[PDB]
Design a protein around this nucleic acid. Sequence first.
RNA 1: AUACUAAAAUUAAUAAUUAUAGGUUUUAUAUAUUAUUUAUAAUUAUAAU
RNA 2: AUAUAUUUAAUAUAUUAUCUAUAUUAGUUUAUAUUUUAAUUAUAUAUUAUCAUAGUAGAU
RNA 3: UGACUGUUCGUCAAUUAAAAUGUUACGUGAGUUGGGUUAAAUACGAUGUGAAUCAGUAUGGUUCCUAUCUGCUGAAGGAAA
RNA 4: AUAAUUGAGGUCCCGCAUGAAUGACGUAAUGAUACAACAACUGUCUCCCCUUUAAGCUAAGUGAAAUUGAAAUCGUAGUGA
RNA 5: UGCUGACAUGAGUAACGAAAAAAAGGUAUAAACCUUUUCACCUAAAACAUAAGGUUUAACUAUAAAAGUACGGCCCCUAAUUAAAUUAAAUAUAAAUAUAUUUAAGAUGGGAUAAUCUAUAUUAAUAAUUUAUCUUAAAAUAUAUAAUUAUAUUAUAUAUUAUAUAUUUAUAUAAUAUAAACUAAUAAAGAUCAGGAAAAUUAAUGUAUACCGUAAUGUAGACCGACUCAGGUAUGUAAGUAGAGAAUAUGAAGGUGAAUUAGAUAAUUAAAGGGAAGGAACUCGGCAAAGAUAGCUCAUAAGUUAGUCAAUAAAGAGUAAUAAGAACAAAGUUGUACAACUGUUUACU
RNA 6: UCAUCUGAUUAAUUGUGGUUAGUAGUGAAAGACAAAUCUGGUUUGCAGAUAGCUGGUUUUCUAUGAAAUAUAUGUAAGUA
Lengths: 45, 229, 146, 96, 57, 112
Amino acid sequence: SRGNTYQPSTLKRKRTFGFLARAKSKQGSKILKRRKLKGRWFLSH
Amino acid sequence: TVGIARKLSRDKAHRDALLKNLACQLFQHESIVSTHAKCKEASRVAERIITWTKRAITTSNSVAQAELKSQIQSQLFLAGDNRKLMKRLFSEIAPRYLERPGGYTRVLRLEPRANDSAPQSVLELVDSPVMSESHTVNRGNLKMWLLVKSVINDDANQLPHNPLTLQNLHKVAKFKAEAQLHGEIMLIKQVLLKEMSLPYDEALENERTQALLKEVYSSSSSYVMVPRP
Amino acid sequence: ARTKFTKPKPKQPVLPKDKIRPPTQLTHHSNNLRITEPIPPTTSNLRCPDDHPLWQFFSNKKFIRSADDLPPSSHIRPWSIPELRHKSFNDLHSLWYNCLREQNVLARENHLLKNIVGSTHDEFSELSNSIRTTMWQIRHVLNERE
Amino acid sequence: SGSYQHLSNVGSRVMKRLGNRPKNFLPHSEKFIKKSTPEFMKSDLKEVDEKTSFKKEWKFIPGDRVVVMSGASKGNIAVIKSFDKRTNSFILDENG
Amino acid sequence: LTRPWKKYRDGELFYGLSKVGNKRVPLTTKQGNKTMYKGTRASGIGRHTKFGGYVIN
Amino acid sequence: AVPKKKVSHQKKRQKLYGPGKKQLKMIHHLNKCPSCGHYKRANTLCMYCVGQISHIWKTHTAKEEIKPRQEEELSELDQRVLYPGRRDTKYTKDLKDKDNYLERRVRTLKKD
RNA sequence: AUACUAAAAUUAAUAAUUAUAGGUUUUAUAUAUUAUUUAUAAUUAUAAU
RNA sequence: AUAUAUUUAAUAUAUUAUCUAUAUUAGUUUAUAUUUUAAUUAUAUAUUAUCAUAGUAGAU
RNA sequence: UGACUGUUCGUCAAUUAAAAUGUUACGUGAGUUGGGUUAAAUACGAUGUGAAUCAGUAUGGUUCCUAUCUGCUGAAGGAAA
RNA sequence: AUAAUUGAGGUCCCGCAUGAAUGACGUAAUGAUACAACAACUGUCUCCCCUUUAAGCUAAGUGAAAUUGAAAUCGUAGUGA
RNA sequence: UGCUGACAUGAGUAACGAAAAAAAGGUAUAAACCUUUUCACCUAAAACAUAAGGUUUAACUAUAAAAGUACGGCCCCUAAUUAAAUUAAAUAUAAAUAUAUUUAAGAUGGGAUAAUCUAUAUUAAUAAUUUAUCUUAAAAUAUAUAAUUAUAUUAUAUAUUAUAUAUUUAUAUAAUAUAAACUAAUAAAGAUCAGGAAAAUUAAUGUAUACCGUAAUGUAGACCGACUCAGGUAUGUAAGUAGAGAAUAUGAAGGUGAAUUAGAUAAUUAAAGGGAAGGAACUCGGCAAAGAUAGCUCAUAAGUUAGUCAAUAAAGAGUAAUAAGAACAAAGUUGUACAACUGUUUACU
RNA sequence: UCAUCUGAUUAAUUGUGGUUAGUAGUGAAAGACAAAUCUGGUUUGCAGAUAGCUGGUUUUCUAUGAAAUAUAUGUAAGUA
Ligand SMILES: [Mg+2]
Ligand SMILES: [Mg+2]
Ligand SMILES: [Mg+2]
Ligand SMILES: [Mg+2]
Ligand SMILES: [Mg+2]
Ligand SMILES: [Mg+2]
Ligand SMILES: [Mg+2]
Ligand SMILES: [Mg+2]
Ligand SMILES: [Mg+2]
Ligand SMILES: [Mg+2]
Ligand SMILES: [Mg+2]
Ligand SMILES: [Mg+2]
Ligand SMILES: [Mg+2]
Ligand SMILES: [Mg+2]
Ligand SMILES: [Mg+2]
Ligand SMILES: [Mg+2]
Ligand SMILES: [Mg+2]
Ligand SMILES: [Mg+2]
Ligand SMILES: [Mg+2]
Ligand SMILES: [Mg+2]
Ligand SMILES: [Mg+2]
Ligand SMILES: [Mg+2]
Ligand SMILES: [Mg+2]
Ligand SMILES: [Mg+2]
Ligand SMILES: [Mg+2]
Ligand SMILES: [Mg+2]
Ligand SMILES: [Mg+2]
Ligand SMILES: [Mg+2]
Ligand SMILES: [Mg+2]
Ligand SMILES: [Mg+2]
Ligand SMILES: [Mg+2]
Ligand SMILES: [Zn+2]
């Protein structure tokens, strides 16, 4: 039985999608800049 | 199995438990309110229990007595507030009905309950003593109280008593000493007066009661029946 | 599982009477103990000191400063910077501490007003703000002197 | 209430957004506000902002005497008892 | 019932007003694994030990 | 399984209010209560009178409110110190305002 | 008689006459022990489960 | 054991009512059981009830 | 009515007075089944250099529907008798 | 082998179009594999009956769905994209 | 089969999601909230502790309290791994970058001491893959005539008493004291699949003990499933009685009886129970449903690759049982085709 | 879901973290899985891709008013 694909764990989620993860890599930086340009309020977890 | 009793949307055991419980509660409290159907079945049980008790009290046969006792035990839950219920049945409850042949319980239709529309009823023991000492009144028989209230109302209005009311009174009397009945009525009446706004003159009230009793106690078409020509 | 067969083995020889030891403790209970109603602690047992330093969080001994018993903003004025400028360091320090103390008393009261009654009058808040202004002025003056 | 909001300032951005409502949608919020206040609290005059409100820069001062025109009591005389800063308005003794 | 004034089945939640919301929000001390230590600008006071203790300076 | 067409206003009306079965009847069966001349359903105890009786019974057969022995002579100040009254949650508050969600039996008219 | 309805029976309580369900009584049935018994009188007599 | 009346010379006897079949300690860590010790802390007593597919089976 | 076969058919067995031939979307899957039969897996024979293919063979293997109207089976209410 | 066998097992060999690591051939064990036979047991069936519970039905409370050109939406024969 | 909004139709229809409730009183306000009693349901759980998770849901704003020892984090130490980080010229490459090498980060692991309660700081000197604990031996208890037979005991885990040495506090000794389970620590040792990495001692001088987690929910109405969704979700304790067991029955204690009730129980459906005479005549096909004459101890052929493989063989016996009489484990024999076998596969035909 | 059935000391099951994927990884191999399903995901962009195909293209009144033949066409649903 599918449907329950997101299996929350705070550690994994901060480590993968978190602000610090984004800011550490060049690709991540691009993403953050993109979100800033769009004016998103929340740049990442 | 089919058509011997109500089913009440419960499987056997549960139904049995319910009915026994209801009987026990009735014995405890003298009067209870529930759904009509439940009441109707509960009465059947309760009446049977009462009769068994009576038989136990009466019959000389030791064997029979024992058997009846056993049956009574089976038909109850003697645990919490029903722990002394066995004693109560023999000592207090059963004696009231020694002369009365069946009809120990009375079911009275109420209004269907608002939320569910389920038809409700009062189930109660018939001749329950209305006056406990060190207490004033008892949580007794509703019908009697209602009758008394009706009588009071009539008196207030200065109207004659309805024939139906009189009939009811007569019924109440049948298995009741006169003096005792009078006393009971008096006890009820004062309380009722207190509850209501109406005033209370003792002697007058007593006189009225006496009058009511007297009529009750000492008893007193277009179609012509004719033989075949 | 238990079945038609079932030979239940006995417990033990329970060491023959003579072999046992005497129990280390003999007399145990008081086989006569009553369950009495509890005995709630009373404040009469205390002697709450009058000059207790925690009274310093209230104006006088009073839960709330009444609207009448507050200093009205017509009378009260915050300290000026220039005026402060000619004040000793020690004195300034003292003033600051006094201000802080006042704020604390206001602060508690303000909290009470907000959280419980849920009032929006904010006189206390205003007072606190005024005090804060004075404090900041003092700070500025201190910096400036240096 | 029962909040602890007073002790903190959180959701600062959100507060700013809700505090600095664009002025062309000010009618909206104000209407709602009007709807949700009793008759004795509410006043017909429009509020002025912290920048728009003046501080003197008033043409009058509480205490002095004043004539009121163009109202129901036009041509009235009254002592101006106090001012309401937010609204840039005066409250007049017993009259007006 | 959960709450007796709501008898009938409405669009009401067991608690609160909406299950969903912005999850991308600064996390506090209360959330996370056992190992997640946030801290509150309270202790740059002493020094941690080799063994787990804390020696104040 | 499924309607072939939108059911016309007429047709639905006649299905609903057309037949007798689906209509509410008038409760003809109702009469005076012997104790107080108010309306009541036939073959049924008056709901007011019975209620009154029940109330009286309750008053008489009231159980003794078992008040603790200590708290009766417990100083007001002391009480305050001990048991300070907290703020109740929203849910609790809601529960408390029973009048909002709970119904008291209505009284009938007087029969003539 | 019956999904709900409809059908059919009763709603007697006074000068008479009419039992609808529950109960109550009756005999009967069902169970499974019972004459080594129960009931009445004084281990004995009579009636019988 | 307690409560309530009785007799006795508060105490004891007996009557009525209510409540009670516990609990603590030993036997080398733990848990359970047994037996001892403590305590008023019980019946190879009559009768029930619940659950086990209506617990299962024989009749009905 | 049976044995055989997915079989309708057909070959037998036992009967029967007889075991007639059709039409009804070769009646009837919003009535049932899904054995045959046109999917995905796999194998065998054959064809193709090969992917793969077959008027082949074999094992496995997926649709669901609370009934608005007609209609029909019952049961009522209204009605002009 | 069955009363009766297009199924099963054995054997015969015009192998339409077997065959040796695309392995050939017989065997023990194993297999929720796929065919078949016997025993036992049964509502699978002859042939259905009864009983229980949850639904269905009625009363109260809440309250969907696909669908929908508009409908004042009968039968038959004929007609006709 | 336009798009958005509004409003219809089906329709006051289906459904309201695993189900045990009753009374009295709160409250002449209650099927649904609370309390009491009765009854039931879960109980190697629907309980009690917890991990993760999350709109704080909690017994709440007057709120979840730690120097640490059968308390966790941080901290020290590393694993797997990660790191526009680090060597005229580390090496390579259209750019982005990639690479080995150092340095740092990185728990799911390791980390002194301690109720006869314990001190981590500063300075100076020079471990464990799995698995078993048998046999023997020793001594003990009874029969029989030192030696034989039969039986249990045998490495550790305290308390009490009596002794000898330092002086009631210490040391060592002797004697006394149940069962079957479990735990930890000890020693010894069998298998092949050969079983982590990383941070010294003494002396002197010291110590005022930081920060954060802590509610409740957690086989669920409080997580992941669009829903207060019969699904998914990690760990420990899991009263007795019984039994080989965490099987199965009960259930002491605790918890729970629910966002639908009340009646009625037509046809009909689901999930059960029973069924005379037949016994596969059903059907594609015994599908489905029946069907167990010990679960302990004996006894068990052909065939065979020699493995009680076949085998839990079928049949059969011992103990129990003479027709009335729990639940759960346990459902036959044989032939053929295909594939040696245990495994893996199309999450959803 | 219920019943029934299979493995149940191992090529076992499982927690916590990590690595490998979009010409592309993982795969006891089923084109199976790579966030409700892939003979190759998703998102943003190229982008108003292209469509000899389907559908759609909104007031009125007046006058005139056809064709479905021939030829050619990778042409026969088109176009000259
Ligand atoms: Mg999702
Ligand atoms: Mg990565
Ligand atoms: Mg959620
Ligand atoms: Mg947490
Ligand atoms: Mg008669
Ligand atoms: Mg149970
Ligand atoms: Mg059809
Ligand atoms: Mg059709
Ligand atoms: Mg299969
Ligand atoms: Mg081969
Ligand atoms: Mg296998
Ligand atoms: Mg309804
Ligand atoms: Mg349109
Ligand atoms: Mg319908
Ligand atoms: Mg219906
Ligand atoms: Mg329904
Ligand atoms: Mg429910
Ligand atoms: Mg109530
Ligand atoms: Mg147990
Ligand atoms: Mg818990
Ligand atoms: Mg490190
Ligand atoms: Mg759920
Ligand atoms: Mg056939
Ligand atoms: Mg056949
Ligand atoms: Mg089995
Ligand atoms: Mg195989
Ligand atoms: Mg993993
Ligand atoms: Mg393929
Ligand atoms: Mg695979
Ligand atoms: Mg023309
Ligand atoms: Mg074309
Ligand atoms: Zn009345």
